[PDB]
Amino acid sequence: VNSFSGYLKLTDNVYIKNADIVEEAKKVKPTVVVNAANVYLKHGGGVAGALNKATNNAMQVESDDYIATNGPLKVGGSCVLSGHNLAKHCLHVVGPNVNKGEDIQLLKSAYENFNQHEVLLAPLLSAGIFGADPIHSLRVCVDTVRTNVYLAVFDKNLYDKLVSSFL
Numbered sequence: 786v787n788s789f790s791g792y793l794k795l796t797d798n799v800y801i802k803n804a805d806i807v808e809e810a811k812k813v814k815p816t817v818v819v820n821a822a823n824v825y826l827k828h829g830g831g832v833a834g835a836l837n838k839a840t841n842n843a844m845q846v847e848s849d850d851y852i853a854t855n856g857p858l859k860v861g862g863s864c865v866l867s868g869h870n871l872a873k874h875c876l877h878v879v880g881p882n883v884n885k886g887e888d889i890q891l892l893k894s895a896y897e898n899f900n901q902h903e904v905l906l907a908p909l910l911s912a913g914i915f916g917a918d919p920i921h922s923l924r925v926c927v928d929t930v931r932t933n934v935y936l937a938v939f940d941k942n943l944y945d946k947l948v949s950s951f952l
């Protein structure tokens with residue numbers, strides 16, 4: 786049993802809810818929250834900007850030190866950093882950004898990072914400001930992630946479309 790409440794069950798391991806991931810993290814304090822990161826860990830907008838704002842910019846300060854030491858992530862890659870006030874850990878995962886021309890086949894590689902963690906609170910990778918087809922992103926999640934993932938969909942309208950269209 787875990788603390789996640791109000792989710793619709795899509796599969797054995799994937800759950801979904803219309804929720805603000807920031808407000809969900811603050812309530813649950815999950816072991817792992819996933820950030821929709823870029824390779825520079827520049828948390829300007831979208832999910833990343835919202836998570837970072839909720840940490841009072843401490844996520845960005847920590848991230849800048851990580852990049853200064855290690856250099857940029859790979860598209861499809863990840864790193865584990867603090868979850869600050871939101872979670873124990875933040876898994877920063879880089880999905881491909883269609884608005885930068887990145888290979889959508891890298892979305893599966895991105896979701897494979899989730900398999901290193903038994904339970905996660907996450908957004909749909911590569912959706913919204915990154916531009917990828919959201920139904921395709923949920924499909925890749927279901928067909929890639931084997932650990933238990935609780936998806937926070939920000940767009941209510943989108944939430945209802947993801948559920949209604951789910952195969």
Ligand SMILES: O=C(O)CCn1cnc2ccccc21
Nearest residue numbers: 909912913937938939940943
């Ligand atoms: O709803 C999500 O969580 C996914 C990212 N996203 C946010 N607003 C959106 C509006 C349209 C499509 C995706 C959108």
